[PDB]
Amino acid sequence: MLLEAIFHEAKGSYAYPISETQLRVRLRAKKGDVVRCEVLYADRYASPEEELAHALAGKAGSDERFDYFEALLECSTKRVKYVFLLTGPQGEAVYFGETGFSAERSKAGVFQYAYIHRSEVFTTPEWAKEAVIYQIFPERFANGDPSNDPPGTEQWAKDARPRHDSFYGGDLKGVIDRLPYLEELGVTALYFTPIFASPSHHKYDTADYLAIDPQFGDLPTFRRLVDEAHRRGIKIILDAVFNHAGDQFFAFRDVLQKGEQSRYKDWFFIEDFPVSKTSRTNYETFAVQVPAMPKLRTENPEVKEYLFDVARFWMEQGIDGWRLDVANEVDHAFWREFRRLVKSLNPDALIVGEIWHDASGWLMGDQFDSVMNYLFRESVIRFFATGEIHAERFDAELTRARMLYPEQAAQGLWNLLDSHDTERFLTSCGGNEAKFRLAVLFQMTYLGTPLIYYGDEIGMAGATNPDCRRPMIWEEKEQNRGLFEFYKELIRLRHRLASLTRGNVRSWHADKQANLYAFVRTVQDQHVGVVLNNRGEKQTVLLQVPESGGKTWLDCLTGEEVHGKQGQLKLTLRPYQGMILWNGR
Amino acid sequence: MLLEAIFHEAKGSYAYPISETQLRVRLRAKKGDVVRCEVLYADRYASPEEELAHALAGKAGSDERFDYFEALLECSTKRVKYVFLLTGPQGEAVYFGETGFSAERSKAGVFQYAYIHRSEVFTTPEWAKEAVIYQIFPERFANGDPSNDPPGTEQWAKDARPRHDSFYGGDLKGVIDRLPYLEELGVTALYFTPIFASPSHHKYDTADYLAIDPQFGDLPTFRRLVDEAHRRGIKIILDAVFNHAGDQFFAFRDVLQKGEQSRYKDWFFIEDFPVSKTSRTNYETFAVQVPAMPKLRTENPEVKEYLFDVARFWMEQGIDGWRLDVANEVDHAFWREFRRLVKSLNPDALIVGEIWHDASGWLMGDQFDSVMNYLFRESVIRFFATGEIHAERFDAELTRARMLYPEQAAQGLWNLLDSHDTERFLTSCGGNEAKFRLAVLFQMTYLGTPLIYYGDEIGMAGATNPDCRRPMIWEEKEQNRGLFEFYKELIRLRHRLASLTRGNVRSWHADKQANLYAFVRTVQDQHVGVVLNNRGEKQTVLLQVPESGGKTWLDCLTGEEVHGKQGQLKLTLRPYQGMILWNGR
């Protein structure tokens, strides 16, 4: 075998505890290069003569070029040393240890996970493990209070097409009035984009972190919203913009006024005074040359303390978690301490980051609970919407992403289809509802946290920002109720099937020709197989199914009862049809 | 090329800053697969159609199976995205990014290092960068005060062969009385094994963390040592045993007496009560079944606070750093807060850990400054002492270890030859001084921090514990002055040639047949080539030397001047001779 392609490290996503006495370990090798992977381990202090314990590492999946093997080590002592025994296709075996590879175990050396502290077991909120989150763009969800509308608010109609500076009067009172709707849909949490006081239309340039923007509401109204959503089993998540503040931020206006005499000058990154200019700026900002968005020096104990007080203030209002913005530009110490603060105030408070690249450095257990799964969106777009990739590629991309972080993070990843900054998924599907639905069926049954973008559940369409920010369609006759019921049904199933929320995922079938993909979610003895026929054709397929997993399944969507004969399940799907097979366990 | 063998990650030891605006990046590939490696990068927010900056990554080294390439990216914005352009032996051009590999730059995507925070730039003490540590085993270094000598103390002679429980009376007073000796040698720091009050001989079972053990001295004496050492340019490093306390530790004593009613019961890991019994332990301890060494619950904020106070106490006494014992069994948060505390009280205080496996998790810059380089010792023993490995294997071992951590850590790793727990290195060489000297020559000119084990510089020998803990030989007649002068000479050169302390490392020559190995240390325009003839035979070697780095060199050990002709240098080395060639720059 090709040893230079084999990999493992005793940390990060390849070695991490799931409990105080259990260490999950993962190893990758060139695809098809390793047939069997066994882990020989023992307590780090075991005598050089004691027998080692064996752990067969099953193949958790494979992507474009790699095979992923996964094992679980039982370490009652909370300390462990281990070596891998790898067997190739033609029987050649080799031990893989910290020292390297060798036919002899001793020369291979041994990896070591020094100690498993309970405080370092990646732990996330139970409710978030089976949540369905709904993204609200407040300005356009519901206008419950016309008296707070910005000057020049345009009419709220379906035939409306938002402009970069449009206004429709969306506010918090509206969200309250429409909570019955959200409860009926079945969402377990609402995620709001910035709603703190800001002079701009987007609100990403914060003026007052301790106040709701007047056009959206005020503290009393926000408290009501929190309480009304809670009694309806709906949690509240706010968007925290701690990387940078607005130019109206009290601290920044002070610097603009007193210059180098300001007591808050070190709360920012200023090259030279005075602080301003035309098309020019002498201080670090969000992105490049964005005057209204001066970057905050979070490394400053004073800045950190202030933002932490902001965090305390809103959590005291009863919110259930945070969605960080440009989190990757704030230092790690801030995030480690942020988690400590947040969790000490509310163990169930969720911390979600938004990072457009490998976020492993933030998903170890000491910082964020999860991040936006942009990888999930890209794979769903190219597979169900544009058709740029086929079932096998789809499978590879999905698997590769899955092996990116520890299972506690991957299990809570926010799986979005679109957002206020992208075209609506329906439009990506060119208006084809059959493709749109197949994608939602996948989203609702895949590993991670489903995130619904307001309006998608009733079939709203739209081009990217700002056309994706149209006023929510509330007229029932104008809503796609067929779709609405589809979402509600998928949501109900997800809550009733433990494997869809707390189960693992394994690819079941992948056919590039028929463009059909199937996977299985598993929890204990329960198995739920999802088969997706992503073709505008009636296709038939043969799936492998050993009696151990059962011989009878039930399609939770149609009630049909399928039967496997001789370890095979014959299925015939309609164009863009998806089946959700439950093994009755 | 084997694409599944190529590696890089935008963090850890493969992507890290060396300053606020410079990012060091490393890429691993199967040896020989890549002949040229370039990096195309830009600010993360740069426009697509914007021209990318170029950075050539030279081959930093190779080990048994891989080539390691290294480049330096200039990032004025402190934000960078990048993709590698790898060229193979046949001229194939493949791009490598976060997405994967592709013949097209766009399809390979880019890695991203979100933001470089100055507080995240790995920083170590300046004095530690060019230090020479001397390990002192107090009981055997010098008996300065017989009044504190424990009962049964033996004689202090060369022919004294220590027993497991022998005594000689070494103490702090003795250290002070011998400071002139240590100053002459040229050591800049003293590393002491545990010396806090303990009822055992070894003192690893701390009874009182706030007191010097009576057999070694008292606080007034310790202070005197700190001051007298300091005015001698000698710093003091203490052994911190924070993973576990002794059974005499006040908190544990209270638990043994008040059991379940004990106020400090949660300061330890107790299975059941009563907290103890005959020959049996019901609480977690160091290693396995060591009743005298109860494990401390450093996760308990109260335990952390106490241990932090302990650190404050000794730092107020003027010490310059800590050598942590069993540090990998203490939680990470503890070490991060420890560093924060230690650096706040004294930015120049050093923190060294001891971990017998990949310590990358503690060497990111937020925890330890460095760790003992056990790999260095293993490589020097097999190459210089036992001859189990030849020059090429030796080269590979060094390179592999060198690429384990970021440069800031690698530069300060303690490169020891032996310790109180191993046989004397001279003994490892079977008494062959010629081999012993070549290893020392190497130790004194290689990357890292040289650590002298008391007595090695005067020719002391001995088998492992306790024969390696023999009474220090103080009779000049009994001391190997020739060797002493050799050490002193090497130490002077190290302090005068900046490249030997702050320069990088590049293998220069490695021949498995001649068993000759050479490397070059480089800083600014200065180049110091170290040539090692590790064979009992006069040999000649032709080394490659492009005129760019100079054409004339001076052997700093003999005064001999060598000249290169047409890019080549002909050197004739005597049996086990090492040369230290300075390029006059």
Ligand SMILES: [Ca+2]
């Ligand atoms: Ca309104």
Ligand SMILES: [Ca+2]
């Ligand atoms: Ca004494």
